[PDB]
Ligand SMILES: Nc1nc2c(ncn2[C@@H]2O[C@H](COP(=O)(O)OP(=O)(O)OP(O)(O)=S)[C@@H](O)[C@H]2O)c(=O)[nH]1
Ligand SMILES: Nc1nc2c(ncn2[C@@H]2O[C@H](COP(=O)(O)OP(=O)(O)OP(O)(O)=S)[C@@H](O)[C@H]2O)c(=O)[nH]1
Ligand SMILES: [Mg+2]
C-alpha cells in the first residue's frame with residue numbers, strides 16, 4: 001500500500017556524471033572521519049595522476065623548475081601503497097608541485113588522461129585539508145568523489161510528500177543491476193556531464209564521453225521496460241562547460257562536426273549577461289539529446305531537460321522544486 | 336539606499352489579462368490577512384449580476400438570435416432586463432432565483448457558448464455555478480472566489496512582500512488603453528517586467544473599440560514595451576496566462592485558431608516542447624504557437640541588453656503561481672546584480 005503511494009525516482013547516467021552529487025544535495029535539503037579519509041584520498045589521487053602523466057603525454061611536459069624533481073620522485077614512490085599515513089612531507093611536496101608551471105600545464109591537458117573532477121578544487125586547499133582540526137564543509141563533501149558499486153536508496157519527505165530515490169553505479173560493470181530498479185518507477189532522472197565532450201570513458205579509453213552518454217540515453221529511451229516512463233534530463237556541469245567554452249582551447253567542433261552549422265535556438269533563454277558562445281554550446285548539447293528523445297515514444301512518455309550544476313545547492317533546490325509538480329502528475333498518470 | 340537594494344517588479348499587460356490576479360497570489364502566498372470582507376461580497380454579487388444580464392441581453396442581439404429553451408422562462412428574462420441599470424440594487428431573493436433558473440435553461444447556455452461575439456467576463460460560469468452559495472447571509476468569500484472576482488484597475492498600486500528574507504516591491508497597473516498613460520511613473524529603477532497575456536483570447540475583441548482582437552492588442556502592446564526607450568535594458572518575464580481556458584477552448588474546437596491567426600495553419604510544434612503528462616497534442620501546439628508569436632518580437636531587437644523569459648500560467652491556480660514565481664527568483668536576483 002505504502003509502496004504505490006511513494007514517489008520513486010531512479011537516477012541514471014554514465015560514470016562521474018553527477019548522480020551521487022544529486023543525492024548529497026537531497027540529504028542537505030530534506031534529511032565524518034571516514035569522509036576526511038575520502039577527501040585526503042581524492043587529494044592524493046589528484047597529484048599522483050598529474051605528476052604521473054607528465055612523462056606519458058605526447059609531447060611530454062617537463063617541470064618549470066628542475067629543482068622540483070625530488071618531489072616528483074617522492075609522489076611516485078608513495079604511489080600505490082597500503083593505507084598511506086599522510087605525513088606532513090606529503091602536503092608540502094603536493095603544494096610545491098601544484099605551484100610549478102609545468103605541473104599546471106599538465107593539468108591543462110587533463111582531457112588526454114583520466115583525471116578526477118575535484119582535482120583543482122582540492123589542490124587549491126591543501127593547507128585547509130592538512131590541519132589537525134580540519135572539519136569538511138558542505139561543499140567539500142559535495143566535491144568528494146567515491147565511486148558507486150551497488151544500489152543506494154535515499155528516502156526524504158518534501159512538503160509532506162514522500163520520495164524514494166535510487167542511485168546506481170554509472171560505469172558498465174554496474175549497468176546490469178539497473179533492471180533491479182525498474183519496478184513502479186515514477187520518473188527517471190538522467191544526468192549528463194556536459195563538459196566532457198573532449199574526454200574519453202575510463203572503461204576503454206577510446207569512446208568519447210559525451211558520445212557514451214548519448215548512446216546510454218538512447219538505450220534508456222527505448223528500453224522495453226521503460227516505455228511509459230518519462231525522463232528528467234539534467235544537462236549537468238554547466239559551470240565546467242562554460243569555463244571550457246570560455247577558455248577556447250579545446251573546440252566542440254573537433255569532437256562534434258555538426259556543431260559547425262548549429263545556430264542558437266530562437267527560444268533559448270540565456271542567463272543575464274551570459275556569453276553568446278556559452279548559450280550556443282549549452283543548447284547544442286541539449287539538442288543532441290532531444291533528437292533522440294523525439295524519435296520515438298508515441299506520446300507515451302516525454303523528456304524534460306534542465307541546465308544544472310550538481311555541486312550548487314541553490315541550483316539543485318530550484319530545479320528540483322520546479323519538478324515536484326510534474327512528478328505528481330506522472331504518478332497520477334500511472335493510476 | 337534602501338531604494339536600490341529591493342527587487343522592483345512591474346506588472347504590465349492588457350486589460351483583463353491577469354495582472355491583479357497574480358498580485359493576490361503573492362498576498363495569499365507571502366502576506367498576512369484572510370481578506371473589506373463586506374466590500375468584496377458586493378463585488379462578487381455585482382460580478383454575478385453582470386454575467387447573467389449580459390448573457391440574456393445578448394440573446395436577441397446575436398446573429399442569429401438565440402431563443403429560450405423553455406418559453407415559460409420569459410417572465411424571468413423580463414425581470415433581468417428590467418433591473419439592468421438600477422444603481423443601488425438590493426439583491427432581493429427573486430434575483431437569485433431567476434438567475435438560477437435561466438442559467439439552467441438550455442437556450443441561455445447556448446448564448447453563453449457564443450460569448451466571443453460579445454463582451455462577457457471571465458468569472459461568469461464560476462459564480463453562476465454557485466448562485467446558491469453566494470446568496471446566504473453568512474456568505475464569506477473563499478480565496479478562489481476572491482481570485483475569480485473582477486474589478487477594473489484605475490491607477491498604480493504597490494504590493495510589498497518577502498521570500499527568504501528578500502524584499503519584493505511589485506507594481507500593478509491598469510491595462511486598458513485609458514490607463515497606459517500612467518505607466519511611465521513606475522519605470523524608475525525597475526528590476527524586471529512581468530508581462531501577462533491572456534492566451535485564450537485568440538477569438539475575442541477588446542472592449543475599447545469592439546473591433547481589435549485581444550491577442551493582437553496584447554502583441555502590439557508587447558512590441559511597444561519591448562522597444563520602449565526607457566526600458567532598453569529591462570528584461571521581461573512573460574506570463575502566458577489563462578492556460579486552463581486555452582485548453583478548454585481548443586479541446587472544444589468550436590472556434591479554430593487559424594480563423595484569427597492564419598499562420599497557425601503552417602506552424603509546427605517545436606522539437607523542444609515539453610507537454611504536461613497526457614496533454615492533447617492540439618493543446619501543446621496551440622500554446623507554443625502563442626508563446627512563439629511573442630518570441631518573434633523579442634528576438635527582433637535588444638542586442639543582448641535584455642531577454643525574454645516565457646512561462647505558461649494559470650493565475651487563479653495558487654500552486655501554479657507559487658511554483659512559477661519561485662522558479663523565477665534566481666534570475667530576478669541575477670537581473671539585479673547585472674544592474675550593478
Ligand atoms: N564542477 C562540477 N563538479 C561536479 C558537478 N557534478 C558533479 N561534480 C563532481 O564530479 C564528480 C562526479 O560526480 P559523482 O556524483 O561522483 O558521479 P556519479 O555519476 O555518481 O559516478 P558513478 O557512481 O556512476 S562512478 C564529483 O567529484 C563531483 O563533486 C558539477 O555540476 N560541477
Ligand atoms: N480561469 C482563469 N481566469 C483567470 C485567469 N487569470 C485571470 N483570470 C480572470 O480574468 C479576470 C481579470 O483578472 P485581472 O487579473 O483583474 O485582469 P487585469 O490584468 O488586472 O486587468 P486590468 O486591471 O488591466 S483591467 C478575472 O475574472 C480573473 O479571475 C486564469 O489563468 N484562468
Ligand atoms: Mg554514484
Ligand SMILES: [Mg+2]
Nearest residue numbers: 354355488508
Ligand atoms: Mg489590475
